[PDB]
Design a protein around this ligand. Structure first.
Ligand SMILES: CCCCCCCCCCCCCCCCCC(=O)OC[C@H](COP(=O)([O-])OCC(O)COP(=O)([O-])OC[C@@H](COC(=O)CCCCCCCCCCCCCCCCC)OC(=O)CCCCCCCCCCCCCCCCC)OC(=O)CCCCCCCCCCCCCCCCC
Ligand SMILES: CCCCCCCCCCCCCCCCCC(=O)OC[C@H](COP(=O)([O-])OCC(O)COP(=O)([O-])OC[C@@H](COC(=O)CCCCCCCCCCCCCCCCC)OC(=O)CCCCCCCCCCCCCCCCC)OC(=O)CCCCCCCCCCCCCCCCC
Ligand SMILES: CCCCCCCCCCCCCCCCCC(=O)OC[C@H](COP(=O)([O-])OCC[N+](C)(C)C)OC(=O)CCCCCCCCCCCCCCCCC
Ligand SMILES: CCCCCCCCCCCCCCCCCC(=O)OC[C@H](COP(=O)([O-])OCC[N+](C)(C)C)OC(=O)CCCCCCCCCCCCCCCCC
Ligand SMILES: CCCCCCCCCCCCCCCCCC(=O)OC[C@H](COP(=O)([O-])OCC[N+](C)(C)C)OC(=O)CCCCCCCCCCCCCCCCC
Ligand SMILES: CCCCCCCCCCCCCCCCCC(=O)OC[C@H](COP(=O)(O)OCCN)OC(=O)CCCCCCCCCCCCCCCCC
Ligand SMILES: CCCCCCCCCCCCCCCCCC(=O)OC[C@H](COP(=O)(O)OCCN)OC(=O)CCCCCCCCCCCCCCCCC
Ligand SMILES: CCCCCCCCCCCCCCCCCC(=O)OC[C@H](COP(=O)(O)OCCN)OC(=O)CCCCCCCCCCCCCCCCC
Ligand SMILES: CCCCCCCCCCCCCCCCCC(=O)OC[C@H](COP(=O)(O)OCCN)OC(=O)CCCCCCCCCCCCCCCCC
Ligand SMILES: Nc1nc2c(ncn2[C@H]2C[C@H](O)[C@@H](COP(=O)(O)OP(=O)(O)OP(=O)(O)O)O2)c(=O)[nH]1
Ligand SMILES: CCCCCCCCCCCC
Lengths: 341, 368, 100, 62, 13, 174, 168, 66, 96
C-alpha cells in the first residue's frame, strides 16, 4: 500500500483470506479464512513510530481472537447437534454464531472496540477496516435465519451509531460511529435481500472510499483542520463537501439511491416499524454530518494566514475527483443499472 | 567526505542518477530502482551556519565547488512573491487589505513591530521546509550530497530572538512551537554542520561591509539582538544538533579560506558511528536494509504533499495570524486573479504558454 | 450442507474438507441427503427431505441409539433401587470378546 | 388521446407489477424456481471426495 | 454577508 | 475409571487456572492441563498420534512464553490461599467418590477406539495412522495444505515485519 | 409448562389478570436486567457486592412498577366500561408515566413519559385490533439475484449425478 | 563467481543443494518409472479383495511371479 | 441429557477459559496463556467432533497451525508493545 511492497503482499493475502471466508460451504473453512484475514491485517495497522497504532492493533487482535474462538466453539456445537453444516430449525447455537459474527462486524452492543480503536489509525487503514473487514462477517450472517437477534442488533446499531457520533469532534471516531450507523442499514437489508445488501455495501464503500481520499490526501484528523484547510477557490470546497450530504442520504445525490433501495425492499417485505426507527436515526447522522458541512457552506471563514498553497498527490487526487463527480451527479445513472430488477 | 583533490578529479557517480523532478518515485517504482546503489562518502548533508552577516553564501558556494556537492542557498520570500512567470506580487498591495499586504525581509527591517512579521517568521520556516525535502530529494535519489545555507532546525532561534526583543507575543511563540512540534520530527537531521563563529560587534561591522540601505537604517540590528542570536545558537541549537551531527566551529573575524575548511572534513572518520546501531550520531541516516532506504526515499519523494499538509493546524486564539473573512475574499479575488497565478503555472495562457489544447502533464511536488 | 456465497475457484479446495464419504458407514446416507440437496435445494431440502436428514442425523450423531441405551441402563438401576432386581443377578450374561 | 395512451400504458404496467408481486410472493413462499429465491446447494464436492476415495482403494497395497 | 464564522464559532469544536 | 479421573483432574485444574494471578502459576497449571488433555484426547482415537502432536505444539509454545515471563513480569508476588486449596481438595475427593460410585459404562465416551471397531472392518487392520492422515496429502485437500505452507510463510513475514530486530532487545522500560 | 410461560394476548383483554401481570413483568425483568448488565460494568461502577445488587434493583424495580401499573390500569379501564378501545391503553400509559415521575421526582418527566407511553399504547392497540404485526416473518427473502444457478464459477469438473428428473 | 563465494563460505549449503538436486532428479525418475508401468495396480493388495469374473477390475489383475 | 452426559464438560471449561481471558489481569501474557487454554478446549471439542467421524481427524492439525499463528501474532504484538511503551500493563495502554 504505502512505502513497502510487503504491504501489497499483505493486501493480496487479505483479499485471498476474505474470499476464502465468503466462499466456504463449511463453517471451518470460513473460520480459517478469518484466521488468514486476521493474519493479514495485524501488520498493516502496526507502526513503531506511532504509540497509539500498536494499541489499536492490540485492541483489534484481542477483539478478533475472542470473536473467532466463540465462532469456532458454536460451529463445533452446531456440528455436534445438527450434524450438517447448517441447522434445520433455529436454536441457541445459531445465536452464538451470530453474536460471534456481530463482534467481528462491529455492530451494537458489541460495537465498543470499534471507535475506541479507530483513534489510533491512519485513514487508509480505517477505510480497509470499515469496508473490507465487514465483507467476511456480514456475508456469514446471511446463512442464519434469525429475526429477533438481528432486529435487536439493527435497532441498537442505528440508535447508538447516531447518538454516539455527536460527542466526538475527531473525524476518525465520528466516521467510525457513522460506519456503525450504516452497519445497521446493512444488517436490516441482510434478512430481506442479499443483493440489496450487496448494493448498499457497494455504495457505502464507494462513499467511504471517496471520503477517505479527501482526508488521506490533506491529512484532516480533526474537525477544525477542515476549517483551516486551504483551497484556492471556495467554490471548490463547497463542491467537495457535498459528499457528506450524499452519505446522509439526501437526494438528488448518489447516496440516496442505496438507502432508497433498502427502504423500497423493506416496505415490499412488510417491515414498517424498524424502518421508521431508522428514519429517526439517519437524521442524527445527517446532523453530525452537517458539522463538517459548516466548514464549506458559509463561503467565507476567519482562516489562518501563514499557509498559502495547497498540495496533493497526482494519481490520488486524480482518482478522487472521478468519484466526487459520481457522488453528486450519480442519479443520472439510474437508467444504466440493471441489478435491481 | 573526500574532496576534489584527493579524489584525483571530478566526482564520478556510483550509478545513474534518478530523474526525481521528472519521474515520480513510488512503491511500484521501488522494485526496479534501489536507493542505496548510489550512496557513497560524498552523499552527506552539510549545513553551513552562522550569524546575520558572516559570508555564508560565498563560503557555501566554494564548499559546494570543492566537495562536488549541490549548492542550496537560503530561501527568501522572492520564491512566492515572484512566481514562475517573474511577476512580483509586491505590486498588488494597493488593492489588498492592510492585514493582507506584502511583508518581506525589508518590511521587517523597516517595521519590526508589525503583526504579520510573526507570520513572516512562520512563513520562513515553511520555506526552509520547502527546501529541506528538496535537499533530501537530492541526496537519496541522485546520490550527491547537498550544502544548505540555513536549516529548518536553525529557525526557532530567530523566533526566540524576536520574542525576547518584544516583536512577538506569547501566542505566536506557542503557535510556532506547535508547528515545529508538528513538523520537525519527519525530517532527517543533517550529517555535518559548520558554524562560523563571530562576535556581536563584528557582525555589525560586516553590516557596514554590505552597505544595503534597509539593514543600515533599521533598528533590529542592535547589540542585544545579535547577542540573543549568539546565545540562542551556542546554548540551545548547536548543543542539540551535536548529538547527531559532527559540529565544526570556526572563527571568521578574518576573511578565511575554504580550503582548510575542506581539509578538516577528511580528517573526520564517519565510519566510527556505524559500530553501534543505537549510536545517537548518524542515527536518522542509518538504514539496515535496502527496503528501508527505499522506504525513506518514498517518504521524501512521494509524500512531500504529506509533509506540506502537516502544516494545516488550527490556531484561532491569536489575532496576528487570523485573516479576516472579508479580507480573505478580497485577497483571493485580487491575488488569484492576478497575471501569472490565474491557473496552475503550467497551464497559463495569459503569459504566453502554447499548446494547451493537447497538454495533460502536471509537475511532481508542485505548488498549485 | 451450507452454500457458497459469491462462489469462486477458491471454494474448490475448501468444499472437500469435512465430509462422510471417506470410508465411513454413514456417508451413503449423507450422499442420499446431498442428492436431494442438489435436487430440491438447500431451502426446499429442509422441508422435503425430513426423512433423509433424520436418518443421517441419528446415523452419525447416534442420538436415538444413545437415548435408547441410557434408558436401558437407567431402568436396570431403577429396578435395583426399587428392589425388583436382585444384586446377584443385577447384570446379565456377558458377550464373547470375539463377538462384535 | 395522449392521455388515453399514457393511461393504458400505466394501467398495464400497474397490472404487471401487481402480477409480478404475487408471482414473487408465491415463489418465495415455496422456493420453487431456480432464479430468484433459490439458495443453491451442490453435491459436487461429496461426489469428488467419494470418487477420490474410490480411486484410493485401488492404490492400497504393496 | 455581514456575519462570517469568527474564532468564537471556531472555539466550540 | 481413568477417564472419569481425568475428568476430575481437568475440572480441578480448570478451577485452579481460573484463580491464578501469576503467569507462572498459569504456565504450570496449563502444563498439567495439557498433559491431562493429551491423555483424554488419546482415549477417543484409534491411534495416539494427535496427542503426541498436540504435546509437541504446546511444549514448543510455552517454551517461548517463559522467556517473555522472565523479560516482562519477572518480578511478581505469589500468594497461596488456604481457601483455594481446601476447595480444590474437597471438590477433588468429592469427584473421585462420585466417579467411584458411578456406572462407568454410561459415563464412557461413545467415540470408537481401535478395539471398539468391529472385526469386519478391513480398514481397521491397516497401519494405525495411515487412513486418518491420508487426506492431508491426497488430491481433494492437498491445496489446503498448499494454503497452509503459504500461510506459514506469510505468518513468518508478518512476524519479521512487526518485530523489528534492528530496534534492539526487548525488556521492561526499554 | 407453568404460569411463568404465559403471554399477554393468550386471553382477551380484561378476562385474565395474573398472566398479564407475569408476562408484562417478564418483559420488564428482561429489559431491566439487560440495561443493568450493560450499566453496572460500564458506567458508574459500584465496586461492591451489595451496591451492584442495589443498582440491579434500581434499574429493575421501577420497570416492574411501570408494568404492573400499566397492566392494572388497563385491566380496571377494561372492566369498568363494556367496550374495549385505545384510550384505556392511553390512560395506562399515563399511569406508567406517573410511575416514571415517582421514580425521578420530576412531574414533567411523568407527564411527557405518560404522553409517549400512551401514544405507544394506542399504536399497539391499533396493531392488535387491526391485525397487522410490528415485526412479521419476512414473506419475500431474496437469497440472490437472477441467474443464481448460472454463476457457478468453479474450476473442478462435476462428476455425474445420482439423481434424475425422469420418472421410472 | 557467486558459486566460489558460496563454496568458500558456506560449503555445507552447496553440498546440501547438490544432494537436494540429486533427490529431485531421483524423485522425477521414480515417478516416471512408477507411472511408466501400471504402478497404480499393485501386485500385492492390502486387505482381502475378491473380484467376480464379469467385473471390470478382474482383467486388470496381474499374474506375475514372486 | 445426551448433550449433558457427553461434551457438556468442555463447554463449561471453555466458558471458564473465556472468563479467564477477560478477567482484570495486570499483564497481557496472562491473556496469552488464557488464549492457549481456550485453544486446548477448542481442540477437545473439535476432537470430539472429528472422532465421531472415522477418518477426518487430519483437520485437527490445521486448527493447531492457525492457533499457533494466532499465538505468534499475540507474541509479536507483545514485542511491539515494547517498541512504543516500556511495559505490558493493560492500565498503561490508552483507553481511547
Ligand atoms: C458450573 C461449573 C463450574 C463452576 C465454577 C465455580 C467455581 C469457580 C469460581 C471462581 C471465582 C473467582 O474468581 O474466585 C476467586 C476467589 C479468590 O481466590 P483466592 O484463592 O483468594 O486467591 C488465589 C490466589 O490469587 C492464587 O495466586 P497465585 O497464583 O499466587 O497462587 C499460587 C498457585 C500456584 O499453583 C500452581 O502452581 C498449581 C499447582 C497445581 C498442582 C498441585 C498438585 C499438588 C499435589 C499434592 O497456588 C495455588 O493456586 C494453590 C494450589 C495448591 C495445590 C492444589 C492441590 C489440589 C489440586 C490438584 C490438581 C491436579 C494436579 C495433581 C498433580 C499432577 C502432577 C503431574 O477464589 C475463591 O474464593 C476460591 C473458592 C473458595 C470457596 C470456599 C472453599 C471452602 C471453604 C474454605 C474455608 C473452610 C473453613 C473451615 C473452618 C472449620 C472450623 C470452623
Ligand atoms: C414492559 C412493557 C410495558 C411498559 C409500560 C408502558 C406501555 C407500553 C406499551 C404496552 C403494550 C402492551 C403491553 C404488553 O404486554 O405488550 C407485549 C408486547 C410484546 O409482544 P407479544 O405480543 O407479547 O409477543 C412478542 C413475541 O411474539 C413473543 O415474545 P417472546 O416471548 O418470544 O420473547 C421472549 C422473552 C422472554 O423473556 C424472558 O425469558 C425474560 C424473563 C425471565 C427471567 C430473566 C432473568 C435474567 C436472565 C437469566 C438467564 C438465565 O424475552 C424478551 O422478550 C426479551 C426482550 C428484551 C428487550 C431488550 C433487549 C436488549 C438486548 C441487548 C443485548 C443484545 O409488546 C411490548 O412489549 C411492546 C411495549 C414495550 C416497549 C414500549 C416502548 C415505548 C417507547 C416510548
Ligand atoms: C514440568 C516440570 C515442573 C517441575 C517443577 C514443579 C514445581 C511444582 C510447584 C508446586 C507449587 C504448589 C503451590 O502451592 O504453589 C504455591 C506457592 C506459593 O508460594 P509460597 O512461598 O507462598 O508458599 C509457601 C507455602 N508454605 C508457607 C505453606 C510452605 O508457589 C510456589 O511454590 C511457586 C510455584 C512456581 C511455579 C513455576 C512454574 C514454571 C513453569 C514454566 C513453564 C511455563 C511458563
Ligand atoms: C421497558 C421496555 C420493555 C421492552 C419490551 C419489548 C418487547 C418486544 O419488543 O416484543 C416484541 C414485540 C413484537 O410484536 P409483534 O407485532 O410481533 O407481536 C405479534 C405477536 N403474536 C404473533 C404472538 C401475536 O414488539 C412489540 O410489540 C413492539 C410494539 C411497539 C409499540 C410502540 C410503538 C410506538 C413507540 C413510540 C413512538
Ligand atoms: C465488483 C463485484 C462484481 C460482482 C459482484 C456480484 O456478483 O454481485 C452479485 C450480483 C450478481 O450476482 P448473481 O447474478 O450471481 O446473483 C447474486 C447471487 N449471489 C450473490 C449469491 C452469487 O451483482 C450485484 O448485485 C451487483 C454488484 C455490483 C454493484 C453495481 C455496480 C457495478
Ligand atoms: C503479489 C505479492 C507482491 C509482493 C511480494 C513481496 C515478496 C517479498 C516480501 C518481503 O518480505 O520482502 C522483503 C522486503 C520487503 O521490504 P521490508 O524490508 O519488509 O520493509 C521495509 C519497509 N517497512 O523485500 C525486499 O527487500 C526485496 C525488494 C522488494 C521486493 C521485490 C520482489 C517482489 C516484487 C513484487
Ligand atoms: C425498549 C425500548 C425503550 C425505549 C426508551 C426511550 C426513552 C429512553 O431512552 O428513556 C431513557 C431514560 C431517559 O431519562 P432522562 O432523559 O435522563 O430523564 C431524566 C428524568 N426522567 O433513562 C432512564 O430512564 C434510565 C436508563 C434507561 C432504563 C430504562 C429503559 C431501558 C430500555 C431497554 C434497554 C435494553 C438494553 C440496552 C443496552 C445498551 C448497551 C449500550
Ligand atoms: C413530538 C414527538 C417528538 C418530540 C421530541 C422532543 C421532545 C423529547 C421529550 C422531552 O424532551 O421531554 C422533556 C423531558 C424533560 O425531562 P427532564 O429530565 O426534566 O429535563 C432535563 C433537562 N436537561 O424529557 C423526558 O422526560 C425524557 C423522556 C425520554 C425520551 C426522550 C426522547 C428524546
Ligand atoms: C487459486 C486456486 C485454488 C484452487 C485450486 C484447485 O482446487 O485446483 C484444482 C485443479 C484440478 O483440476 P481438475 O479437477 O482436474 O479439473 C480440470 C480443470 N477444469 O487444479 C488446477 O486447476 C491446477 C492449479 C492448482 C493450484 C494449487 C495451489 C492453490 C493455492 C491457493
Ligand atoms: N526576521 C527574520 N529575518 C531573517 C531570518 N533569517 C534571516 N533573516 C534576515 C536577517 C538579515 O536581514 C538577513 C541576513 O541573512 P543571513 O543571516 O541568512 O545571511 P546573508 O543573507 O547576509 O548571507 P551571508 O551570510 O552574508 O552570505 O536575513 C529569520 O528567520 N527572520
Ligand atoms: C519439482 C517437482 C518434482 C516432482 C516431479 C514429478 C513429475 C515428473 C514428471 C512426470 C511425467 C509423467
Amino acid at each position: 500500500m504505502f512505502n513497502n511492497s510487503s504491504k501489497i503482499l499483505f493486501i493480496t493475502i487479505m483479499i485471498i483470506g476474505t474470499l476464502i471466508t465468503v466462499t466456504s460451504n463449511s463453517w471451518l473453512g470460513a473460520w480459517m479464512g478469518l484466521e488468514i484475514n486476521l493474519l493479514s491485517f495485524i501488520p498493516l495497522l502496526s507502526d513503531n513510530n506511532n504509540l497509539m497504532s500498536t494499541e489499536a492493533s492490540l485492541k483489534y487482535f484481542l477483539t478478533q481472537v475472542l470473536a473467532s474462538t466463540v465462532l469456532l466453539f458454536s460451529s463445533i456445537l452446531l456440528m455436534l447437534k445438527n450434524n450438517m453444516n447448517n441447522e434445520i430449525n433455529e436454536s441457541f447455537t445459531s445465536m452464538i454464531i451470530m453474536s460471534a459474527l456481530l463482534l467481528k462486524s462491529g455492530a451494537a452492543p458489541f460495537h465498543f472496540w470499534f471507535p475506541n480503536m479507530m483513534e489510533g489509525l491512519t485513514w487508509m487503514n480505517a477505510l480497509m477496516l470499515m469496508t473490507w473487514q465487514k465483507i467476511a462477517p456480514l456475508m456469514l450472517i446471511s446463512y442464519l435465519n434469525i429475526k429477533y437477534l438481528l432486529l435487536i442488533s439493527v435497532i441498537l446499531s442505528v440508535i447508538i451509531g447516531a447518538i454516539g457520533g455527536l460527542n466526538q469532534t475527531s473525524l476518525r471516531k465520528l466516521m467510525a460511529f457513522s460506519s456503525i450507523n450504516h452497519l445497521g442499514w446493512m444488517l436490516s437489508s441482510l434478512m430481506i435481500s442479499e443483493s440489496i445488501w450487496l448494493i448498499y455495501f457497494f455504495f457505502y464503500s464507494f462513499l467511504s472510499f471517496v471520503l477517505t481520499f479527501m482526508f488521506n490526501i490533506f491529512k484532516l484528523f480533526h474537525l477544525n483542520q477542515l476549517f483551516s484547510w486551504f483551497v484556492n477557490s471556495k467554490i471548490l470546497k463547497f463542491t467537495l463537501f457535498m459528499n457528506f450530504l450524499s452519505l446522509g442520504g439526501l437526494p438528488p445525490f448518489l447516496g440516496f439511491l442505496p438507502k432508497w433501495l433498502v427502504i423500497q425492499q423493506l416496505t415490499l417485505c412488510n417491515q414498517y416499524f424498524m424502518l421508521t426507527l431508522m428514519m429517526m436515526s439517519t437524521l442524527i447522522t445527517l446532523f453530525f454530518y452537517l458539522r463538517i458541512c459548516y466548514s464549506a457552506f458559509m463561503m467565507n471563514y476567519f482562516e489562518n494566514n501563514w499557509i498559502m498553497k495547497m498540495n496533493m498527490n497526482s494519481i490520488n487526487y486524480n482518482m478522487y475527483m472521478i468519484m466526487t463527480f459520481f457522488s453528486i451527479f450519480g442519479l443520472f445513472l439510474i437508467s444504466l443499472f440493471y441489478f435491481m430488477f | 567526505i573526500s574532496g576534489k583533490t584527493m579524489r584525483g578529479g571530478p566526482r564520478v557517480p556510483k550509478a545513474a542518477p534518478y530523474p526525481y523532478k521528472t519521474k515520480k518515485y513510488s512503491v511500484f517504482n521501488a522494485i526496479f530502482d534501489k536507493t542505496s546503489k548510489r550512496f557513497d562518502e560524498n552523499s552527506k548533508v552539510i549545513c553551513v551556519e552562522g550569524p546575520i552577516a558572516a559570508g555564508k553564501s560565498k563560503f557555501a558556494k566554494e564548499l559546494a565547488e570543492e566537495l562536488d556537492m549541490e549548492y542550496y542557498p537560503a530561501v527568501d520570500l522572492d520564491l512566492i512573491y515572484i512566481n514562475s512567470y517573474g511577476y512580483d506580487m509586491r505590486k498588488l498591495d494597493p488593492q489588498l487589505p492592510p492585514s493582507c499586504r506584502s511583508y518581506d525581509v525589508r518590511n521587517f527591517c523597516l517595521d519590526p513591530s508589525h503583526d504579520l512579521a510573526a507570520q513572516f517568521q512562520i512563513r520562513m520556516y515553511m520555506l526552509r521546509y520547502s527546501q529541506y525535502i528538496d535537499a533530501l530529494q537530492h541526496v537519496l535519489s541522485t546520490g550527491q550530497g547537498v550544502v544548505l545555507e540555513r536549516s529548518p532546525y536553525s529557525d526557532f532561534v530567530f523566533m526566540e530572538a524576536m520574542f525576547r526583543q518584544g516583536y512577538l507575543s506569547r501566542g505566536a511563540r506557542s503557535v510556532y512551537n506547535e508547528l515545529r512540534q508538528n513538523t520537525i520530527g519527519e525530517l532527517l537531521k543533517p550529517h555535518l554542520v559548520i558554524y562560523l563563529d563571530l562576535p556581536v560587534d563584528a557582525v555589525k561591522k560586516q553590516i557596514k561591509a554590505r552597505n544595503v540601505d534597509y539593514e543600515v537604517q533599521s533598528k533590529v540590528f542592535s547589540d542585544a539582538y545579535l547577542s540573543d542570536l549568539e546565545q540562542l545558537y551556542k546554548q540551545q541549537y548547536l548543543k542539540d544538533i551535536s548529538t547527531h551531527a559532527e559540529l565544526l566551529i570556526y572563527d571568521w573575524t578574518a576573511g578565511g579560506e575554504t580550503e582548510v575548511v575542506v581539509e578538516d572534513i577528511e580528517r573526520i572518520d564517519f565510519n566510527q558511528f556505524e559500530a553501534d546501531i543505537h549510536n545517537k550520531k548518524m542515527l536518522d541516516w542509518r538504514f539496515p536494509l535496502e527496503a528501508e532506504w527505499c522506504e525513506a526515499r518514498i517518504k521524501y519523494c512521494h509524500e512531500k504533499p504529506d509533509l506540506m499538509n502537516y502544516f494545516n493546524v488550527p490556531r484561532f486564539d491569536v489575532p496576528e495570524l487570523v485573516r479576516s473573512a472579508d479580507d480573505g475574499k478580497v485577497w483571493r479575488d485580487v491575488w488569484f486573479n492576478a497575471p501569472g497565478m490565474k491557473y496552475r503555472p503550467g497551464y497559463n495562457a495569459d503569459m504566453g504558454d502554447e499548446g494547451l489544447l493537447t497538454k495533460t502533464k502536471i509537475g511532481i511536488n508542485q505548488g498549485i | 450442507s451450507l452454500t457458497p456465497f459469491l462462489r469462486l475457484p477458491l471454494t474448490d479446495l475448501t468444499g472437500c474438507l469435512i465430509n462422510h464419504q471417506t470410508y465411513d458407514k454413514c456417508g451413503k446416507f449423507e450422499m442420499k441427503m446431498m442428492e436431494c440437496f442438489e435436487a430440491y435445494g438447500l431451502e426446499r431440502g429442509k422441508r422435503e427431505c425430513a426423512d433423509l436428514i433424520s436418518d443421517f442425523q441419528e446415523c452419525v450423531g447416534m442420538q436415538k441409539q444413545l437415548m435408547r441405551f441410557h434408558a436401558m441402563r437407567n431402568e436396570r438401576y431403577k429396578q435395583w433401587l426399587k428392589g425388583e432386581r436382585k444384586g446377584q443377578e443385577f447384570f446379565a450374561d456377558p458377550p464373547r470378546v470375539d463377538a462384535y | 388521446e395522449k392521455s388515453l395512451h399514457y393511461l393504458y400504458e400505466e394501467n398495464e404496467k400497474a397490472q404487471i407489477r401487481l402480477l409480478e408481486d404475487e408471482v414473487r410472493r408465491k415463489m418465495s413462499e415455496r422456493n420453487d424456481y431456480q432464479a430468484y429465491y433459490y439458495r443453491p446447494s451442490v453435491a459436487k464436492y461429496h461426489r469428488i471426495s467419494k470418487e477420490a476415495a474410490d480411486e484410493l482403494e485401488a492404490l492400497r497395497g504393496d | 454577508a455581514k456575519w462570517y464564522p469568527d474564532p468564537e464559532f471556531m472555539k466550540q469544536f | 475409571m481413568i477417564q472419569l479421573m481425568l475428568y476430575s483432574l481437568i475440572i480441578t485444574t480448570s478451577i485452579i487456572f481460573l484463580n491464578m494471578i501469576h503467569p507462572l502459576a498459569l504456565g504450570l497449571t496449563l502444563l498439567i492441563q495439557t498433559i491431562f488433555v493429551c491423555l483424554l484426547t488419546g482415549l477417543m482415537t484409534k491411534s495416539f498420534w494427535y496427542s503426541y502432536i498436540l504435546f509437541l505444539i504446546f511444549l514448543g509454545g510455552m517454551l517461548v512464553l517463559f522467556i517473555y515471563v522472565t523479560s516482562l513480569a519477572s518480578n511478581e508476588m505469589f500468594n497461596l490461599s488456604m481457601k483455594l486449596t481446601l476447595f480444590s481438595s474437597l471438590i477433588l475427593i468429592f469427584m473421585l467418590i462420585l466417579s467411584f460410585i458411578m456406572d462407568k459404562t454410561s459415563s464412557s465416551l461413545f467415540l470408537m477406539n481401535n478395539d471398539m471397531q468391529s472385526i469386519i472392518n478391513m480398514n481397521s487392520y491397516f497401519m494405525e495412522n495411515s487412513l486418518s492422515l491420508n487426506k492431508l496429502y491426497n488430491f481433494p485437500t492437498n491445496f489446503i495444505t498448499i494454503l497452509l505452507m503459504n500461510y506459514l510463510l506469510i505468518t513468518l513475514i508478518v512476524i519479521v515485519k512487526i518485530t523489528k530486530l534492528f530496534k534492539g532487545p526487548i525488556r521492561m522500560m526499554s | 409448562m407453568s404460569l411463568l410461560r404465559s403471554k399477554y394476548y393468550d386471553h382477551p383483554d380484561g378476562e385474565d389478570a395474573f398472566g398479564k401481570i407475569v408476562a408484562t413483568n417478564k418483559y420488564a425483568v428482561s429489559a431491566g436486567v439487560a440495561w443493568s448488565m450493560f450499566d453496572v460494568l460500564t458506567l458508574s461502577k459500584p465496586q461492591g457486592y451489595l451496591p451492584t445488587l442495589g443498582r440491579f434493583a434500581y434499574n429493575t424495580g421501577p420497570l416492574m412498577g411501570m408494568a404492573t401499573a400499566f397492566t392494572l390500569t388497563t385491566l380496571v379501564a377494561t372492566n369498568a366500561r363494556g367496550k374495549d378501545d385505545k384510550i384505556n391503553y392511553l390512560i395506562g400509559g399515563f399511569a406508567a408515566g406517573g410511575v416514571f415521575g415517582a421514580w425521578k421526582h420530576n412531574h414533567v418527566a411523568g407527564l411527557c413519559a405518560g404522553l409517549f407511553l400512551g401514544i405507544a399504547g394506542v399504536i399497539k392497540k391499533m396493531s392488535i385490533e387491526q391485525g397487522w404485526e410490528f415485526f412479521p416473518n419476512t414473506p419475500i427473502k431474496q437469497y440472490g439475484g437472477l441467474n443464481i444457478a448460472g454463476n457457478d464459477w468453479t474450476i473442478m469438473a462435476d462428476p455425474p449425478k445420482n439423481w434424475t428428473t425422469e420418472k421410472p | 563467481s557467486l558459486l566460489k563465494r558460496a563454496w568458500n563460505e558456506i560449503p555445507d549449503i552447496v553440498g546440501g543443494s547438490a544432494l537436494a538436486l540429486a533427490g529431485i532428479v531421483m524423485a522425477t525418475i521414480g515417478v516416471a518409472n512408477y507411472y511408466a508401468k501400471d504402478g497404480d495396480n499393485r501386485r500385492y493388495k492390502l486387505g482381502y479383495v475378491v473380484y467376480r469374473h464379469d467385473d471390470p477390475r478382474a482383467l486388470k489383475v496381474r499374474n506375475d511371479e514372486d | 441429557m445426551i448433550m449433558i452426559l457427553y461434551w457438556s464438560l468442555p463447554m463449561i471449561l471453555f466458558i471458564l477459559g473465556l472468563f479467564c481471558f477477560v478477567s482484570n489481569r495486570k499483564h497481557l501474557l496472562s491473556m496469552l496463556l488464557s488464549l492457549e487454554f481456550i485453544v486446548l478446549m477448542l481442540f477437545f471439542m473439535l476432537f470430539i467432533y472429528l472422532n465421531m467421524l472415522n477418518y477426518e481427524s487430519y483437520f485437527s492439525m490445521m486448527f493447531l497451525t492457525f492457533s499457533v499463528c494466532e499465538g505468534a501474532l499475540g507474541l509479536s504484538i507483545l514485542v511491539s508493545m515494547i517498541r512504543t511503551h516500556g511495559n505490558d500493563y493493560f492500565q498503561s495502554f490508552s483507553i481511547m
